């Protein structure tokens, strides 16, 4: 599923991400934009041979099991394919563990490089939330 910006904002808010570990909704929408262009089916290969899955590009190295990432963990205890669903519940619940792990949203290199220190409120401008 390719979400609209405000559609994703509303889904992430309903799923409890607004100010989760202190990160305003705009941060999460900004992250999803630059990670996946709001596309739940987005997959990308990492240099280490791990893969990033779904709207928040969650990595098989640590968080999910894709059956082909040697010497990896499955800390969200999910198949990586669950992160590709039109339903963002698994992505959001896994993202909550990730951002809690000590590095906050710096775990998403695209958040650090493209969202951090920017006016992220712009990502939820005009949305009914
Ligand atoms: Au909180
Ligand atoms: Au992208
Ligand atoms: Au900011
Ligand atoms: Cl689970
Ligand atoms: Na990416």
Swiss-Prot record:
InterPro entries: Glyco_hydro_22, Glyco_hydro_22_CS, Glyco_hydro_22_lys, Lysozyme-like_dom_sf
Enzyme Commission number(s): 3.2.1.17
Matching Gene3D superfamilies: 1.10.530.10
Compartment(s) of residence: Secreted
A cellular-component GO term for this protein: endoplasmic reticulum
Annotated ranges, domain C-type lysozyme: 1-129
Function: Lysozymes have primarily a bacteriolytic function; those in tissues and body fluids are associated with the monocyte-macrophage system and enhance the activity of immunoagents. Has bacteriolytic activity against M.luteus.
Protein name, as recorded: Lysozyme C
Species of origin: Gallus gallus (Chicken)
């Amino acid at each position: 599923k390719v979400f609209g910006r405000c559609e994703l904002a509303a889904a992430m808010k309903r799923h409890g991400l607004d100010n989760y570990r202190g990160y305003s909704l705009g941060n999460w929408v900004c992250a999803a934009k630059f990670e996946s262009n709001f596309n739940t089916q987005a997959t990308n290969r990492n240099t280490d041979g791990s893969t990033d899955y779904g709207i928040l590009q969650i990595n098989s190295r640590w968080w999910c099991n894709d059956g082909r990432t040697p010497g990896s963990r499955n800390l969200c205890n999910i198949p990586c394919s669950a992160l590709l669903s039109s339903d963002i519940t698994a992505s959001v619940n896994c993202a909550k563990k990730i951002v809690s792990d000590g590095n906050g949203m710096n775990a998403w290199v695209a958040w650090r490089n493209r969202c951090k220190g920017t006016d992220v409120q712009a990502w939820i401008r005009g949305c009914r939330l």
